[PDB]
């Protein structure tokens, strides 16, 4: 299947002379392998998947350097944006950066992205084609200009199109055991009456990887929707994911309703029905 490497940085200011908070995390598909964290006890880039504890002192001296670097630039940005937005020093504000790699089923480059937020809003971002920028608002425009002067798109692109894929395909190979699984969802369907004239049906997907999944519910043929509770997909904590879908149905008519599961591990899409 396709695969993807992503890095997520978050920097939060604190009122006054306090130092900001900084957090780095790096993922392969849906699997965290590295964290850094200013509030933590190490001030190094620490490992989180067992296949990355494989990497030697150099790798960890370097990443730590890269992380500290970003953090420095984040801390400066926070001062700047505060000016640009005309804001007191009383407030805690937030600065968020996502960037990374997508490769297709042959591990050839598919696409990449770089995106930066300020107080939960898009601020600036690299266009899909990795050459141009979208600036929300006119403080972003000042940035756009600065970053154009410094050929920032080119640099990021050279990374995205190169080392990022390079190393991803390394970690796929080093991670081969774990990262390269596809785990089909395990289903069941619970039935509990909620009145003398209605019953709840719940459709469960459990123990699947990666996260992307699609449960839905239909009555006769075509679909209910609106009428169905559906929890957002969630982590179980052992590197797999869960989700369920639920509709209340007229009691005694529960063998009209049917439930559909779609996922990459499932060669052929399941339709589940109350299985009493």
């Amino acid at each position: 299947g396709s695969h993807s490497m992503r890095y997520f940085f978050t920097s939060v200011s604190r009122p006054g002379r306090g130092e900001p908070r900084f957090i780095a995390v790096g993922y392969v598909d849906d699997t965290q392998f590295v964290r850094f964290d200013s509030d933590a006890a190490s001030q190094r880039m620490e490992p989180r998947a067992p296949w990355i504890e494989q990497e030697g002192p150099e790798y960890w001296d370097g990443e730590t350097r890269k992380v500290k670097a970003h953090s420095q630039t984040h801390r400066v940005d926070l001062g700047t944006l505060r000016g640009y937005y005309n804001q007191s020093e009383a407030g805690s504000h937030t600065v968020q950066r996502m960037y990374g790699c997508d490769v297709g089923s042959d591990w050839r480059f598919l696409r990449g992205y770089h995106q930066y937020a300020y107080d939960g809003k898009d601020y600036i971002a690299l266009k899909e084609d990795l050459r141009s920028w979208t600036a929300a608002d006119m403080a972003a425009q000042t940035t756009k200009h600065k970053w154009e002067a410094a050929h920032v798109a080119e640099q990021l692109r050279a990374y995205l199109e190169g080392t990022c894929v390079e190393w991803l395909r390394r970690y796929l190979e080093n991670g081969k055991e774990t990262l390269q699984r596809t785990d089909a969802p395990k289903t069941h369907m619970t039935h509990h009456a909620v009145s003398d004239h209605e019953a709840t049906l719940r459709c469960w997907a459990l123990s699947f990887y990666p996260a992307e999944i699609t449960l839905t519910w239909q009555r006769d043929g075509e679909d209910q929707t609106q009428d169905t509770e559906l929890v957002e997909t969630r982590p179980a904590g052992d590197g797999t994911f869960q989700k369920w879908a639920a509709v209340v149905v007229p009691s005694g008519q529960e063998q009209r309703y049917t439930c559909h599961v779609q996922h990459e591990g499932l060669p052929k899409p399941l339709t589940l029905r109350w299985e009493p």
């Binding site: 890095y7 601020y123 600065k146 920032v152 990021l156 990374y159 390079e166």
Partner: peptide, 10 residues
């Protein structure tokens, strides 16, 4: 492997 190029003040 984080990027070492392309990250610079706004």
């Amino acid at each position: 492997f984080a990027t070492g190029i392309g990250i610079i003040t706004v």
